[PDB]
Amino acid sequence: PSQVLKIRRPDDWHLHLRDGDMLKTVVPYTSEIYGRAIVMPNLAPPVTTVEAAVAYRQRILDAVPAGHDFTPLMTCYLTDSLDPNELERGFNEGVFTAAKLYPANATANSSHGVTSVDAIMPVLERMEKIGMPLLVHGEVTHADIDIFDREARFIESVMEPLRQRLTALKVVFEHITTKDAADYVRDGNERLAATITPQHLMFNRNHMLVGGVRPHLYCLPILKRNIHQQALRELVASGFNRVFLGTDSAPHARHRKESSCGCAGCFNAPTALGSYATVFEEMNALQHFEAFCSVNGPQFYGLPVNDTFIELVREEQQVAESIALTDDTLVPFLAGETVRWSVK
Amino acid sequence: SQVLKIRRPDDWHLHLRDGDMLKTVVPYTSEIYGRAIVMPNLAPPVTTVEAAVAYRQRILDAVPAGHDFTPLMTCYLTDSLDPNELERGFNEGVFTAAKLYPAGVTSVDAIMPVLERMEKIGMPLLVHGEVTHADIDIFDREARFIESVMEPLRQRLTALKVVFEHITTKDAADYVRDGNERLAATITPQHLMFNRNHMLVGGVRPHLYCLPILKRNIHQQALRELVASGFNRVFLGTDSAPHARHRKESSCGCAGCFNAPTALGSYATVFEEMNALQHFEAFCSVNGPQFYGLPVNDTFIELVREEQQVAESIALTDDTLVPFLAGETVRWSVK
Numbered sequence: 001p002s003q004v005l006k007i008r009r010p011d012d013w014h015l016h017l018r019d020g021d022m023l024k025t026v027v028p029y030t031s032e033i034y035g036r037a038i039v040m041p042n043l044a045p046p047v048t049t050v051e052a053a054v055a056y057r058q059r060i061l062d063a064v065p066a067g068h069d070f071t072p073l074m075t076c077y078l079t080d081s082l083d084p085n086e087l088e089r090g091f092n093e094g095v096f097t098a099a100k101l102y103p104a105n106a107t108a109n110s111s112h113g114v115t116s117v118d119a120i121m122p123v124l125e126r127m128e129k130i131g132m133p134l135l136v137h138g139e140v141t142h143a144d145i146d147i148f149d150r151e152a153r154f155i156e157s158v159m160e161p162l163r164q165r166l167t168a169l170k171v172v173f174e175h176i177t178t179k180d181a182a183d184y185v186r187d188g189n190e191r192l193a194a195t196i197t198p199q200h201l202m203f204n205r206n207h208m209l210v211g212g213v214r215p216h217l218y219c220l221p222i223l224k225r226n227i228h229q230q231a232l233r234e235l236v237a238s239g240f241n242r243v244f245l246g247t248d249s250a251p252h253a254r255h256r257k258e259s260s261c262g263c264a265g266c267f268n269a270p271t272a273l274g275s276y277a278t279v280f281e282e283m284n285a286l287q288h289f290e291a292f293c294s295v296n297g298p299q300f301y302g303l304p305v306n307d308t309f310i311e312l313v314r315e316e317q318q319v320a321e322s323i324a325l326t327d328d329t330l331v332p333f334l335a336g337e338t339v340r341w342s343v344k
Numbered sequence: 345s346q347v348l349k350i351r352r353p354d355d356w357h358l359h360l361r362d363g364d365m366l367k368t369v370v371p372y373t374s375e376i377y378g379r380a381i382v383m384p385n386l387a388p389p390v391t392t393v394e395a396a397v398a399y400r401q402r403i404l405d406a407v408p409a410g411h412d413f414t415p416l417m418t419c420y421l422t423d424s425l426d427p428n429e430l431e432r433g434f435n436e437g438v439f440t441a442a443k444l445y446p447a448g449v450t451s452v453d454a455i456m457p458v459l460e461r462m463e464k465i466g467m468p469l470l471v472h473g474e475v476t477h478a479d480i481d482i483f484d485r486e487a488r489f490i491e492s493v494m495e496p497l498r499q500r501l502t503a504l505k506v507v508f509e510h511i512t513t514k515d516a517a518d519y520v521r522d523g524n525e526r527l528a529a530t531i532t533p534q535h536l537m538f539n540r541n542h543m544l545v546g547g548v549r550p551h552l553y554c555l556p557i558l559k560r561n562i563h564q565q566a567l568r569e570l571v572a573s574g575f576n577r578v579f580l581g582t583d584s585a586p587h588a589r590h591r592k593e594s595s596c597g598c599a600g601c602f603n604a605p606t607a608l609g610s611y612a613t614v615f616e617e618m619n620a621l622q623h624f625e626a627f628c629s630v631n632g633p634q635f636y637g638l639p640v641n642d643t644f645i646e647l648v649r650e651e652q653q654v655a656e657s658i659a660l661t662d663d664t665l666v667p668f669l670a671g672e673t674v675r676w677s678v679k
């Protein structure tokens with residue numbers, strides 16, 4: 001009989017659900033499998049108020065198929081103009097589970113982003129005071145920094161000084177992609193965690209660039225050299241308990257991916273969980289798989305572990321080539337491939 | 345506006361393709377360049393004298409009347425090519441050079457008799473210098489080739505003339521700079537103008553995707569310094585490498601920049617920025633002929649520093665062709 005892997009129902013600690021018709025298409029891929037997800041706030045315009053988060057939460061709930069037990073955990077997009085009182089109210093009311101810091105840029109509109117981290121110290125101090133976790137997309141985006149160096153540079157110039165300045169702040173280093181970040185997180189304290197995507201465990205930059213350019217593997221932070229991939233694999237396989245599942249499922253229509261300027265992001269919600277199983281199996285570390293998927297995130301966030309179970313079966317299945325949208329189509333992670341593990 | 349008059353250039357590394365694509369792209373080259381080295385990587389490749397003669401005629405058929413353009417043909421090396429076939433083509437003026445692609449040839453040691461014949465007859469070897477092993481990071485493949493293939497080959501065949509095509513690294517720039525009169529290189533406009541950030545920051549840009557891949561800024565800067573120094577064994581080779589739009593903009597986009605329409609003005613900009621216009625003519629019009637033992641062109645063209653607006657697309661029989669720098673501006677124009 002085909003091998004079965006039973007786990008406590010997982011959660012996705014880093015997800016993009018988009019809005020409108022695309023939200024309606026993509027939510028089911030998450031809600032069928034995961035009990036909760038951290039829903040990122042990078043809509044156009046971004047979610048920067050309690051009222052917007054409440055309304056978005058309801059649009060997500062509207063799109064959940066009948067019978068799925070799925071709870072979106074909302075986030076606030078940090079911006080220069082965000083009122084610390086607004087963030088705190090949302091946290092106190094259970095609307096915002098966390099706040100998300102995207103890379104700083106001096107040219108950012110104060111309504112849409114952060115100009116410098118120093119400029120938002122009032123909101124960061126407030127998060128520290130109230131115990132609200134900060135989720136970080138840790139890259140510095142200065143034009144003179146090579147794209148492959150941007151994560152490592154963030155550690156030195158932003159992450160370490162911030163954590164020294166605000167010693168009680170809880171931080172998730174999202175979607176880490178480098179040995180630099182893996183080591184930093186491994187050597188950190190109980191207030192520092194990380195998420196890792198399936199693509200950054202499965203692939204390295206050669207997969208994106210050798211034999212052709214593959215925009216469906218193009219995402220931020222960019223896939224790194226093999227030595228970084230291996231460090232990430234070793235970190236999850238070690239059993240380190242402050243790394244956890246965050247897909248960064250980030251859907252874009254096919255025409256927006258396969259263009260003269262392809263958008264960053266992998267639509268991996270359909271195939272992520274089986275992909276993680278494949279990685280943990282290859283690393284001879286399946287004894288750490290459930291904790292990564294279903295325990296470590298809840299522990300860091302101070303939330304209960306799910307009390308229902310799901311099963312993956314080690315039986316081969318083909319991934320769809322594409323998934324229809326109202327207009328155009330979405331190309332899933334591993335489209336058309338035969339995969340080793342799927343959900344029963 | 346400033347005007348720069350130069351000897352008519354040549355393009356020492358060009359892909360013209362075949363069929364309808366050839367008809368579309370040839371005029372962008374023939375209107376400007378006196379000669380071009382026409383690469384042999386057709387499907388199937390040009391590996392015989394007969395095939396090269398027929399291809400040359402198809403190229404000439406596509407050259408507008410009044411363009412004095414001569415294609416210089418090349419042979420695609422393979423592990424099993426007959427040295428007599430290659431020499432015959434050289435002696436007949438059919439093959440100007442032979443091109444070594446990384447695997448076709450199973451290995452270089454496998455082609456030693458062909459390379460020995462080339463050395464004896466004075467036929468230049470044009471090298472796409474990358475190693476191919478799956479575990480080698482793509483950004484390392486040029487540097488690794490220098491140590492494991494290029495330096496051993498040149499030590500074995502010390503009289504062989506070699507062009508290190510489309511160099512992309514400080515490693516290659518330094519190797520060529522420090523080499524002897526039997527080693528030269530070509531450099532494309534894209535590897536002087538851009539680095540990998542331009543291809544990957546703010547979106548993935550398949551029209552900048554080419555082999556050898558764009559490298560880190562430190563490599564770009566080394567290439568710029570090399571051409572600006574006046575070093576006389578580097579010369580213009582566009583590696584213009586056209587593909588239809590939806591072969592580029594795809595789930596697995598093809599490598600190659602269609603830069604023939606914009607290359608010359610783009611090079612002029614680089615030389616100007618590097619305060620090295622005194623070395624521009626030699627790069628475009630003298631160094632390559634010197635290395636190949638061919639006369640310089642006897643006509644002259646002018647560039648003017650007036651912005652040229654690059655077309656968004658070029659019509660094909662099916663699909664379109666997106667020029668390198670589509671919709672952008674080039675600072676220098678051909679008068």
Ligand SMILES: NC(=O)N[C@@H](CC(=O)O)C(=O)O
Binds near residue numbers: 554
């Ligand atoms: N440079 C490229 O990316 N492509 C060239 C091949 C080559 O010059 O090696 C082509 O012919 O398409």
Ligand SMILES: O=C1C[C@@H](C(=O)O)NC(=O)N1
Binds near residue numbers: 016
């Ligand atoms: O930081 C990001 C954003 C995400 C998206 O498309 O929302 N896509 C990515 O690849 N990374």
Ligand SMILES: [Zn+2]
Binds near residue numbers: 137174175220221
């Ligand atoms: Zn991110």
Ligand SMILES: [Zn+2]
Binds near residue numbers: 248
């Ligand atoms: Zn994200």
Ligand SMILES: [Zn+2]
Binds near residue numbers: 472509510555556
């Ligand atoms: Zn080449």
Ligand SMILES: [Zn+2]
Binds near residue numbers: 357358359383583585
């Ligand atoms: Zn080429």
